[PDB]
Each structure stands twice: as structure tokens, then as C-alpha cells.
Nucleic acid binder design. Sequence first.
RNA 1: UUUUUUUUUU
Length: 1009
Amino acid sequence: LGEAYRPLEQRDMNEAEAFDVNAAIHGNWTIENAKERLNIYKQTNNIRDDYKYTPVGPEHARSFLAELSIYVPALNRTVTARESGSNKKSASKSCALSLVRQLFHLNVIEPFSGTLKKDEQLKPYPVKLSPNLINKIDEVIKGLDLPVVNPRNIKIELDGPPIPLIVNLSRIESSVIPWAPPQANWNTWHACNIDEGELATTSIDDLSMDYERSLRDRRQNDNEYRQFLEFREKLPIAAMRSEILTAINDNPVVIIRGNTGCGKTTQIAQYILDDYICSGQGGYANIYVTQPRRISAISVAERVARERCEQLGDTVGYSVRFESVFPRPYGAILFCTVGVLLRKLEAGLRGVSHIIVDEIHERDVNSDFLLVILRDMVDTYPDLHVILMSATIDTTKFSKYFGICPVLEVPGRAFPVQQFFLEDIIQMTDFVPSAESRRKRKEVEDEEQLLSEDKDEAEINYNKVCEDKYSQKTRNAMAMLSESDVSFELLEALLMHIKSKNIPGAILVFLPGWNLIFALMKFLQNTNIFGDTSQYQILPCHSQIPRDEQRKVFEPVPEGVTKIILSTNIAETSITIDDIVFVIDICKARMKLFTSHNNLTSYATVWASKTNLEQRKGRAGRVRPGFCFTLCSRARFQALEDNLTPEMFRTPLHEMALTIKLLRLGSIHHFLSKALEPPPVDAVIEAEVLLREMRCLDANDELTPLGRLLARLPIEPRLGKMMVLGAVFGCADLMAIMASYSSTFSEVFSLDIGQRRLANHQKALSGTKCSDHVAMIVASQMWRREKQRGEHMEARFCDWKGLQMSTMNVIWDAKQQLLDLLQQAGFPEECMISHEVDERIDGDDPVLDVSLALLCLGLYPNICVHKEKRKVLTTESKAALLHKTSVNCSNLAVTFPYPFFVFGEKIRTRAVSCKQLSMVSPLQVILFGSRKIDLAANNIVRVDNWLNFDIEPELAAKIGALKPALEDLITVACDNPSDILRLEEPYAQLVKVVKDLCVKSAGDFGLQR
RNA sequence: UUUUUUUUUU
Ligand SMILES: Nc1ncnc2c1ncn2[C@@H]1O[C@H](COP(=O)(O)OP(=O)(O)O)[C@@H](O)[C@H]1O
Ligand code: ALF
Ligand SMILES: [Mg+2]
Ligand SMILES: [Mg+2]
């Protein structure tokens, strides 16, 4: 017997902001006429709405948003505009312009019927070429049979318009994203057939059998895994596992709303996968989980691997740009950024069973774009499952967008978080701001009193609103504090109060950007208490610090040391930093704005939304109880937006339009009209016109081979087009690194707090070239060799030269990626050989010279002309300054060998600044930095209606005739990437003469300079 | 704290 044994001042600013580059594509509606037209519209249609103004920035860099919405009965539609400007006047003009332009394109208002206003011409710049060079031009023109304008037969040089010297002439089904259920011999993650080893005799059922046996074995026998299961069962979301799985199983789309920390991201993917595994079907599951941020995808993937007692690479993986650990091909979970999933769409999503779109409230352009796609995909493929998740969403709006889908409400949280507002913080600390700080703030305010605009009820001071529940002293003190500026005194007092409680735990401080993070770090490190490394370690957290320093925020500190993390919103959602007990929220966020009509970028520090505050708060109360010190008044909190405005509303759309066409999803307008919030129609029009003019789209708005290639590169299309010519000219390596530098906000050189300019050893990297691009190239060439010697050597080198290590790495990784992608498109290795730049050469350098010339194409229309000292002139002689960070910036009376600079960015501060600058020669501008080359009065050749040249008009026409040939060359290259270094002879000679033309001195024949 | 750097891409 027995069972075991039983047998069988500042005038320039407004003028720079009023500049309007694109009225001609928007009905001739421009800055100076839009407000008046809108006033006429408002009078005709009895519209009482006025501009809503929002202050932006600290008091010392105050700007404004202006918003206006108009309901149009005829369309049953509200048209909204939202724009920024240095003051209310510029913001309201830009706002009115957007609104009028939208109304024009929707046929509610007419085109403007008058002529637009097109003085003081700039002095002509002399240009002369050798007879030898001119002969080569003639040979190329003959060889390519190019039409050339003959200015002998150009009569009127009196008082008429300039005459063109270019003839711009060339010479020669919309699908759904593929999907399928799981299939043998297919890797879902790479979208390719496997063909190797043992999915030869191995079916998906056999795999499933193996996974179930293995999991069931571990469930009984693996103590660590057993413990993790016990832990997991106690999470708030476990109470709804079955209900959630049933909803997912029976519906193509589901929404999960659950509190911060309740278990959405760590658990749901496991619930789905384990439900397949335990039922003998583990091989028929493959789950993508998108996160908005890189740190979230990586961090949560690491956690989920640990909950399963595995190494990344088995059932759990991640993929972010430059860094992937892919899981096994069947029965797996891949965490990624939204952008990665959008790039995977090109190859189809065959074999994906479930897509979890996490933190779906973010409203970045990628997330909204993905929602459009996925809604169409579930309609076409009703067996696909999509799961949308957030703590912080309007479920009704998302449910409606998806045709009404299930909404699952998860109650509870892991641990409580005690919340305090500014009043509470002042009262508990007995804070009073110092005499010094009060005087300094009135001093900055009293010089605003001269430049001040009307203070409207939209600029209430919510620090002077407080209930009498608080002491009179608390109220007086609060009323002394700026809402715009961060009081480091208050922060210190709060940190001391936290210390006095004797509660161990890390402190997480949310700040809008780098500048505040590093200023507060310095401030704290200078104190006796917080500067003592035996008591505190202060860690920054920002996207642009080294990867290893980001990882330090998650890690412990020594015994008795308190961790203070000073972080941007990269730590706002998704992540568990396991030792957080206290959150301090400054209640701000930073946006990068772009106004299309004037080409101005700016950074805006704005009030965070209630959504942002709730996510930030939710970094505590995850592993133990916590505290959230929200540094705004209770009345300010009530006045915060529920959410920040969607990115789709304020971003150029041309990259997304290319993606729409690449993925063959049909019409750009139609696709974007299906967005959760459709973008304003003027931005859609701008995008289409840009892509047509760049030749990415043909006459039928279909993708050209150039457009298809550019849609696949992770850079601005204009930089992509520059790369194609780079390849043709044998300098793709240099072009890639410059494109990469032009595509990151991460800065090359470090400057101290309040440092006015680069040090000499940093400027010296430019050598003789007067070029930020060269300085960056040279820095990269040196850094590259130090990186090869190891981490210590790399860091030491960066400290020695004042380089930002993380920037060097990202520029390199992006550059290598671009080159790999060009190789994949068929361009030969030989066109992207490294060429070391020697910055110390004073004079011509053929490979560098053509490289910098091609920047004029990639960064067009950003050409400026040096006037004196830091002052330059941009298009149509608008004033600007050389950015303080440029190697070319000096307060002394510098003169440059040539006055022309190409630049990466035109930034709006208290002044307009040009940033990322390279000196370029006149022919480089004429050839590559121009759309029009016209003959003006008195034989002056005028480029783009403002750069004047004293050059033989006949010669300018000959040079100009090369520009359409260069476009044809790009067509030839994109038709056959593999043949670009063995061109038919007339194109090979074009390449040669253009190299000659781009030599630095080629326009200086017999000229002193 | 006298504004170089919110994010993100095969
Ligand atoms: N690294 C970690 N250490 C300890 N606990 C963790 C860690 N990561 C997650 N958790 C636990 O799992 C819970 C759920 O995390 P997660 O699924 O990321 O929450 P949500 O997606 O709902 O915000 C956390 O509240 C915490 O209790
Ligand atoms: F909802 Al979470 F971290 F993803 F709070
Ligand atoms: Mg989550
Ligand atoms: Mg002349």
C-alpha cells in the first residue's frame, strides 16, 4: 500500500518675428494683414471670443502663448490657433495668421487680393573664377546638353524686376499594414524567415509543449520564482486578472485605466503570455509593449525579466534606438519605444498577437500617429488585439475614438502618498523668503515695468490666493514668492524639513531642464549639509547625461547616505526607483516650439498639467508609503490644464507625411483627418508643398525613389537629400556626422554656469575654418581614439577638452546608423570611407570644402551674412546674433575670410540667434545655398532676392545651369545606388567640376579678400 | 538660478 509505491532697443526682435516666408502658399495671408482680416470676420459673424494669453518662462525670459478658437457654423467645426511670440503683440499676430490661413484653406475666407510687399540692398560681393575652371564648366554644360540662360538677351536693367538665370527643368493601390497569425519558421521581431537549425522539425505546438512543461516545473520547484508569484498576486491589478484577460480575448481593442503603480506594465503582458503558456499555446503569443521613453522600455523590461527569474533575451526583451536585447521568437514580450514600433511597421507585423500601447495619454506625435494606424489595423484584422493603458486619461475620448470599446477600471494602489501644496510647505517649514531674494525680484520686475504689456485676468498671481485655513504668516510669505522662478531657498528649507523627520528614503525633484538641474546641484553642493557626500549624493537625471549615470539613479547609495535625484520628465512615468520616499515637484515642463512662417525656434518653460503632476507623484507609493511636495499653490493647481496640448497641433508634419506615403496608407490629408486630434490644415499644406519642392513627391503626390529613401532615414528629409549627394561625392562619412550633429539637441562643448563663451582650447578645434561643424568633426576624431582605449580614457579626454561625453556618443552612433542605412539601400562602402580632417590647414582642402558646401543644401535656407562683431543678417536683412556657444562668437571686432555662414538653427531668446555655424565661400552659397539666381539692375546677380554678387552674369547663368543637373544626378543616384561611383561620363564630369567649384578659394581668382 | 541641451527613430 501507499500511493508512492502503488504498482500498475529690441526693434529687431519684432521685425525678425514679423518675417513671413510662405504667404504665397496660404492665399497671400501674412502677418501684417491677418489680424485685420480676422477683425472683419469677427464683426461679420458676431464672434465675441478674444485672445487667451499664457505667460511662458521665468521672469527674466518672459514670452507668451496666444490662443483663439472660432466656431464656424457653415462647417460645424471649431478652428483653433495656438502660437507663441516674444510679447503679446507677436503672439497674437502669429495666432491670427494661423487661424486666417486655416480658414482660407477650408474655403471660409477668400485669398488676399493685393500684392505683398517685397529696402537697402546689401553691397555686391565680388566673385571671380580662373579661365581653367570656366572651361570645365563649359565642357560639363556641353556634355549634359544643359539649357543655359543667355543674359546678353536680357534687356531691362532699369527699374523692373530681376530676371531669372536658371531654367529649373528636369530630364526623367494604397495598402494596409501587413499582419498574420503566428507561423512556423518566422521571427516576428525581425520579420524574416528563420531557415537555420531547428525550426526544421519543430512546430509551434512542440514549442508550446516545451514552454508549458518548463513554466509548470518552475512554478513548483523554483523558490525564487515562487516568491515572485506570491509578491505579484498582492498587486492591486491581480484582483482583475481574469476579467482583464477575458476582455482582451473577446475584443480587438481594450482600455485599462489603473492608478500609478497598480501593475499595468509589469503584469498585463505577463498575464497574457502566461495564459497562453499554461494552456499549451505559448508559441502562439507575441506581445509588443510600447513606452514613450527609452529609460521606461529598458527599466520595465529588466524588472519583468527579474519577475520571471530570467535574463533579458529569453521571454523578455527590449528595443530602443542603438540598444536592443531581443527575446526568443515565439512566446515573448518586447518592450520598445513607440518610434521603434513605427519603424517596424515597414516590414509588417506578421506574428504579433498583442500590442500594448502604454502611457497613451502622452499625446506626442508618434503615439497619436500609432493610434491612427492601429485603429485601421484592427478593422482589417479583427484577430489582432490592442490594449491601451494609462493612470491618467479621458477614457470616454479614447473609447469613442475606437468606436466604443471596453474600459476596465482597476481600483487601488500599492501604497499611499501624502500630498502637500505650497501653502502646506511654507507653513510646515515656517518659510519666509530672505530680504535679499525679495529685493532682487522687484529689481528684475521694475525693468519689466518699462517693457510691460497689459496684465489681464489671464496673469492672476495664484500665490496671492490662499484660504484662511492657513495662518496669516503662511499667506504673506506665499504672496512674496514668484510663481515663475524656482526659490532654491525654499527647496533648501524643504530638504532640511525632510531631513528632520528622520525617515530614510530617496528624494526625487522634478525640474524642467538641464539648466535648473545643474544650477540646483551646484547650489546644494555648496551647502554644508547637502554638499557632504557622507550624508547626500545628488544625481542628475536627463536624456543627455551618459547612460551609466542615468542607471545610477536606480542604484543604492552607501549606508546612511540619502540619494537626491534632480530629474526631468524622463522619470515622470513608468519607472520604479525602488528607494523613492519623497517627490518634490516644481510643476513645470519644457517644450521646443517652431513657428513656421518666420523659421524661429524657441524653448518654452510652461506650467505642467494635472496629468503630469499625478504621474510625478506616482513615482512614490510604489514599494512603500511616500510623500509628494507639489510646489504650487492650491489655487494654481485648480487653474492648471488637465493635459498639455497634443504635439500634433504644434509640429511640422513633413516627416510624418513621408511615413504615411512610405507605409502606403494613402492620402496625407485623409490619414491626418483620422487623427485623435487632426492637425491644423495650414501645417498639412506646408508639409505637402515642402515634399513636392524637395522632389520627394511627384506630380501625383506619389513617393519618388528619393522620397522613399528619405522616409527611411531618421533625419530631416533635407539632411537626407544632402546625404545622397554626399555619397555621390565620396564624402558620405563627413556628411553623416554633420547630419547627426544637426539632428540632436545634445551639446558638444560644456560651458560653466553663466560662462559667456567657449574657451580658447575649445575654439581651437575649428582651426582655420571658422566652423562649429569642423570643431565637432575634429572633437569626434580625437574622441573616437580615446573611446577605443576604454571608459576612463574617454571620460578623461572629455574633461580635458571640455566636451560632453554623451553628445560625442550619440553623434557617433547616429552617424554609424545613417551609413549602415545607406549601405542597406545599396550605396557602396567606397563612398563612405573615413577622411580625417586636418583643421590646421590654412587654405583649400577639397574633401572638406565640398562637404561644407553640401551643408548649404542640407541646412537651406539658413544662410547668414556677418555684419560686425556678433551681428549677422539673415534672409532679407533681419538682424541676428552669433550664438554664444559658436566658435565664431566674439565680442571683439573680428573679420572673417568670407562673410557667409550656413547654420543649423535660428533661435528666439531676448535676441534672435544663429546656432551651429560654418563659414562658406560665395560659390558654395550660389550653387548649393540658393533657389533663385537672378540678374538685377546694374549687372548685379542676386540670390534668393537678398544676397548680391558682383560676378559675370553669363558665368552665374552657367553655374546656375548646373543646379537642375545636380537634381537629375540625385534622381540618377536614387534609381541605382550601387552605381554612383561609376557614373555615365557626362554625370562623372559634373561631379568633378562641382568639386572644383566648391574648393574654398575657387571664387577668389585675382581677388585680394 | 543672469535661459547651450523637453523628448524620440530600422
Ligand atoms: N524595481 C522594482 N522594485 C520593486 N518593486 C517594483 C519594481 N518595479 C515595479 N515594482 C512593483 O510593481 C508595481 C507595479 O509596477 P508597474 O506595472 O510598472 O505599475 P504601472 O504600470 O501600473 O504604473 C509597483 O507599484 C511596485 O510595487
Ligand atoms: F502608471 Al505607471 F509607472 F506606468 F504609474
Ligand atoms: Mg506602467
Ligand atoms: Mg559684374
